[PDB]
Amino acid sequence: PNRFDRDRLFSVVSRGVPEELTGLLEYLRRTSKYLTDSAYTEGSTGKTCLMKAVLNLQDGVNACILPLLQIDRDSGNPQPLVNAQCTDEFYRGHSALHIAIEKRSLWCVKLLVENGANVHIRA
């Protein structure tokens, strides 16, 4: 259960179950590797865990988002996983807050802005 990778975490945040998020703390604190690193993001576009979480929402709920935010800012880079956007030429600049606005969900917009989110982000 200690072994962690992109596919497991993406599936977990897709389902939307917070009970499976336990364990990331120890793995990240033992590898001293931030989730914002290119390793945990898709190499082609640059999609991160939040984008995967928001693109699939069950009648406007995703309970994994908030715990993901705490495990973000508890140990993160000076721009913790909320100021990071896509890197491909086609979706360059596109951040998670743009997804939140596009999905017409004000709750996740509040969650993203209340934990720090650049409201400019020129896509």
Side-chain angles (χ1 to χ4, degrees):
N2 52 33
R3 173 71 262 175
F4 286 155
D5 80 349
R6 291 174 61 251
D7 291 331
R8 189 271 300 164
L9 183 63
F10 277 25
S11 66
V12 165
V13 295
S14 66
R15 309 252 173 103
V17 293
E19 70 270 16
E20 311 188 15
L21 274 298
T22 69
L24 294 174
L25 278 298
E26 292 82 3
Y27 183 44
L28 268 72
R29 294 293 180 88
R30 79 165 70 99
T31 55
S32 81
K33 182 174 73 176
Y34 317 125
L35 192 152
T36 61
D37 198 1
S38 186
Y40 292 166
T41 197
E42 184 180 0
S44 162
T45 185
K47 182 179 287 185
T48 187
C49 52
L50 282 72
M51 316 181 184
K52 182 44 91 194
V54 185
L55 294 174
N56 62 186
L57 59 84
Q58 324 91 41
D59 290 4
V61 298
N62 278 320
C64 295
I65 293 174
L66 183 63
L68 183 62
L69 268 295
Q70 292 83 18
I71 62 170
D72 189 359
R73 82 292 183 276
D74 64 3
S75 68
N77 208 46
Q79 65 293 3
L81 163 78
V82 66
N83 293 319
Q85 60 270 18
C86 298
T87 49
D88 55 352
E89 191 264 352
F90 199 77
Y91 291 166
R92 172 135 64 231
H94 187 96
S95 177
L97 191 151
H98 294 76
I99 293 151
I101 294 176
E102 182 65 26
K103 297 296 289 183
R104 323 202 72 156
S105 174
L106 172 84
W107 173 34
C108 55
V109 163
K110 292 179 182 179
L111 303 179
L112 294 150
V113 67
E114 292 178 354
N115 303 55
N118 188 359
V119 176
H120 298 285
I121 301 299
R122 293 180 178 94

